[PDB]
Amino acid sequence: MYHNSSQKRHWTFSSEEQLARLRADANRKFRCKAVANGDPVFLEPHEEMTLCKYYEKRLLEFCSVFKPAMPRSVVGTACMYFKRFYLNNSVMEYHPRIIMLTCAFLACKVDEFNVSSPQFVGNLRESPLGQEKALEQILEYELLLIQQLNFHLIVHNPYRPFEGFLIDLKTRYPILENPEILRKTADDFLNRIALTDAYLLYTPSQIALTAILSSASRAGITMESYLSESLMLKENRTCLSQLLDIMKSMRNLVKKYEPPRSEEVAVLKQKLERCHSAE
């Protein structure tokens, strides 16, 4: 259950500023290690975040065409693993292309999606020797990924809460005649919320409900009565205020999201491979 989960206890943070602090610590600490070992070789934290967004997109479409078809719960778990790992680790120390594959590999085990290592690595477009070397790299990084997750492997995703809200709407909110037409636009909005840091800042239920109400607004249906009288928030007004503020803050995180620029990524990848060829 989310309400006593490790995700809620340890991996839901107060603000975007705190996440920025954690990533800044990671970048600073790798810089300190690199100077203590032996300049503009280093990536800035915003450069690391740009590369992390690019490689999260890469992880998404790796899972999208993965055969056998990967459940959405596994994909969400893997993306959450990626986000959590790079909160406290630098892409200059651990390459994101290996880490994203390791995240998918571990999420397949945690979510009980039985995949053999050969059929896992068969999904990469590489020569068989390259597949073997990728597999060896993943097996090298699997324990590291688990340690950096602090052995918190269960990830609570917004998908089942989304389904539960649809059930509750169909059963208890007749003035929304057919909640199912809200699905697609809500799902789209969920996919956008996932690109942001919201999964580290909000509960899965809050994320699902925000997606649903944003879909309703795109269809020009108001749902204030679902919150106030169905979820019974008209009896605890400060709860309604907090929930509305949470949803507005999420919508603004989606509004101010900036995808990695392709020229930006082209340059930053050269910098990253320079970092990893050296050191």
């Binding site: 259950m1 309400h3 839901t12 539960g164 800042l201 909000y202 509960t203 899965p204 239920s205 929930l243």
Partner: protein
């Protein structure tokens, strides 16, 4: 030194979820897929899926980090 039942009181930080028994009574089970006879013979009902989905939808909806 006698025992008496007391239900598990764990804060869900969210709206109240109706009990398993009441889901059909309240019209929830009209919106979940019916359990097949093979599923039913093993003890799996649509009520289980519905209850878990509702519990996840309401879990921590009001909680602040």
């Amino acid at each position: 030194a006698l025992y008496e039942y007391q239900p598990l009181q764990i804060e869900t930080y969210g709206p109240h979820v109706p009990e398993l028994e009441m889901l059909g009574r309240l019209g929830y089970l009209n919106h979940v897929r019916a359990a097949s006879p093979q599923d039913l013979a093993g003890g799996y009902t649509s009520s289980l899926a519905c209850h878990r989905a509702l519990q996840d939808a309401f879990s921590g909806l009001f909680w602040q980090p």
